[PDB]
Design a protein around this ligand. Structure first.
Ligand SMILES: CC(=O)N[C@@H]1[C@@H](O[C@H](C)C(=O)O)[C@H](O[C@@H]2O[C@H](CO)[C@@H](O)[C@H](O)[C@H]2NC(C)=O)[C@@H](CO)O[C@@H]1O
Length: 618
């Protein structure tokens, strides 16, 4: 009430005293993922502050830094790094931001990973998203990280989407909106600034904006009804920030520019559109929080617009923060920042960007820093004290317990005929573990090893088969014939098996098609030899359509395995626990699964999921 009124006035008074260089500095958020010091031969992961990076923070007075996995490998190192970044910031504390989404996008080396957004979708309950946001937020807070670029509220209603997929809650706008809203609230309750992404909605692309500039051709009515819906709900409920999409939406803005690549005309990406960022987001939708660009180093921008140019265009469009405006990995490259600043200055001096617009943007940034307790600094503990506290919080047993429950709830049973599941092996049974990569067979193996040690199943022998880039051969059939039980993980991004007249082609010997051909070959051999067989879908669940013949089929919505003594995601263990009757899946599909054998039909509908014991829909 009065705090918000005081905050706006304080932000105004503070910005009125800043020089233009200081104001423009606040609007930049670089990364320093890697760094090459004086005397070093090439850039390496920046895990510890040095005086070279600190001097650039002091010189350019950035508003924030985005951190990547390279920068946050251990809790102890992270707390030291964020303290050191704040010590380097000469006047205003930094936003220190990160992509700790959960599931398949996480960064913290020792943090709790969580099963991810589509898993939260499968589990349905919005309180689970709140708990996820809250725990991630608590971990980030302990680490001195104050901004999370989460939640993704893109709606994955194009199954071929290669960049969103299980990063989305759902193909349904209400489920996505509800879980996005509660993620955001959980983060904010821990005083973490939360950014909705990617506006105005990246869900219906089949092109990755990392590698090319995607186009969404839907009309305004559809965009308002679907894409914009979860953004509006979270904006109305007090979203702090919104990250843009480098994606073309001609229904909102058909302005074109001459590409710097091929000289051709290209539709403006939303990030650089005044109609989208000011007309729609700011004015129509009433968002007055911080608008941050998607990363400006991505091909969707960098291919077609110059480096300085993209930053200037983004600010002209109405964004408040330019994310990763230039890549500087040594002091020899530091003028890149000076050139971005000078380009912004010229735009202000010529009136192309009124100085008042700069003031308003910096006031938003400062206001957010005050609102979330970044400014002034709240914590008077020593770094040693902060480290000790964070080591008890980040990846804590309580957090691991919560992660396990959520991952297990999310497991979605799609088929279980004649009680194929749970597997109940006799002593000495041979279990064949089949998955694309060694980390995935290792995750399944370790989980089973733990079950044996904890006397949950009888002792069994385990063999592994890693099938990425392989073609199913006699040696593989022999292993199938020798097994008593077979667990196979399937991994797809875009599910594109070759099918003719309703028949999936199993005659394909091109090893590059391994993802859609090899698991089917294992199934076929297992069924032919009357072997208990379960297929676990590991990434996008659409591959469930590749296994209509199977008697047992589950989806876990997360594919990362086990490496260096650590589970990189909880999803595979949760699925293995379900397979052996040691967890209760409660998942229902948060997307439709299109039929592969009958194109244009839905094989499994949104909301479908079985009770593993009874076979009745949940
Ligand atoms: C490991 C790593 O550094 N990845 C990043 C990208 O992050 C995404 C989330 C990933 O791991 O797949 C990053 O992608 C974009 O950039 C923003 C900042 O990281 C993200 O917040 C944003 O969500 C993401 N945009 C989309 C559409 O996913 C990318 C940008 O250069 O750099 C690495 O690939």
């Amino acid at each position: 009430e009065a705090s918000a009124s005081k905050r706006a006035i304080d932000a105004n008074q503070i910005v009125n005293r800043m020089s233009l260089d200081e104001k423009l500095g606040q609007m930049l958020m670089p990364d320093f993922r890697n760094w090459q010091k004086e005397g070093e031969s090439s850039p390496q992961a920046l895990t510890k502050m040095n005086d070279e990076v600190a001097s650039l923070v002091k010189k350019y007075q950035f508003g924030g830094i985005i951190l990547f996995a390279e920068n946050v490998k251990t809790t102890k190192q992270t707390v030291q790094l964020t303290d050191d970044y704040q010590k380097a910031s000469p006047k205003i504390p930094l936003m220190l931001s990160i992509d700790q989404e959960g599931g398949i996008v996480t960064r913290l080396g020792e943090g709790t990973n969580f099963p991810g957004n589509m898993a939260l979708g499968a589990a349905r309950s919005r309180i689970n998203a709140y708990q996820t946001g809250s725990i991630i937020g608590k971990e980030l807070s302990a680490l001195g990280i104050n901004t999370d670029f989460s939640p993704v509220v893109d709606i994955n209603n194009n199954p071929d989407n290669p960049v969103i997929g299980v990063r989305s809650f759902s193909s349904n706008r209400e489920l996505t909106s509800r879980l996005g809203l509660y993620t955001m609230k959980g983060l904010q309750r821990q005083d973490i600034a939360s950014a909705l992404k990617h506006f105005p909605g990246h869900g219906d692309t089949d092109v990755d904006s990392h590698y090319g500039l995607p186009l969404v051709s839907h009309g305004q009515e559809r965009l308002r009804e679907v894409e914009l819906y979860p953004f509006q709900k979270a904006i109305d409920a007090g979203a702090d920030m919104v990250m843009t999409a480098h994606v073309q939406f001609p229904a909102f803005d058909d302005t074109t520019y001459k590409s710097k690549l091929d000289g051709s005309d290209i539709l403006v990406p939303a990030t650089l559109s005044k109609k989208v960022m000011t007309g729609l987001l700011r004015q129509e939708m009433g968002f007055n929080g911080v608008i941050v660009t998607n990363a400006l180093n991505m091909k969707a921008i960098a291919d077609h617009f110059g480096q300085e140019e993209a930053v200037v265009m983004a600010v002209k469009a109405g964004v408040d923060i330019a994310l990763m405006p230039a890549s500087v990995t040594s002091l020899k490259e530091e003028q890149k920042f000076a050139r971005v600043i000078q380009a912004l200055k010229e735009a202000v001096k010529n009136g192309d960007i009124p100085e008042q617009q700069i003031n308003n943007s910096v006031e938003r940034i400062i206001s957010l820093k005050i609102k979330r307790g970044m400014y002034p600094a709240r914590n008077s503990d020593s770094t040693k004290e902060k480290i000790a506290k964070a080591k008890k919080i980040v990846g804590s047993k309580q957090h691991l317990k919560a992660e396990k429950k959520l991952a297990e709830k999310a497991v979605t049973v799609l088929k279980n005929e004649q009680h194929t599941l749970p597997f109940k092996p006799k002593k000495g049974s041979r279990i064949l573990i089949v998955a694309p990569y060694e980390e995935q067979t290792a995750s399944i193996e370790q989980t089973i090893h733990d079950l044996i040690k904890r006397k949950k199943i009888k002792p069994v022998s385990l063999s592994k088969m890693n099938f990425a880039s392989q073609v199913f051969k006699t040696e593989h059939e022999k292993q199938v014939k020798e097994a008593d039980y077979i667990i196979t993980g399937s991994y797809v991004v875009k599910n594109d098996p070759v099918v003719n007249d309703g028949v999936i082609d199993d005659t394909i010997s091109d090893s590059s098609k391994w993802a859609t051909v090899f698991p089917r070959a294992v199934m076929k051999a297992a069924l032919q030899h009357n072997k208990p067989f379960v297929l676990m879908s590991l990434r996008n669940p659409y591959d469930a359509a590749n296994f209509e013949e199977a008697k047992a089929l589950i989806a876990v919505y997360g594919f990362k395995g086990y490496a260096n003594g650590r589970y990189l995601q909880p999803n595979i263990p949760a699925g293995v626990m379900a397979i052996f009757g040691q967890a209760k899946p409660k998942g229902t599909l948060p997307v439709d699964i299109p039929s592969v054998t009958k194109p244009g039909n839905t094989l499994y509908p949104l909301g479908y999921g079985l009770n593993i014991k009874t076979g009745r829909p949940l």
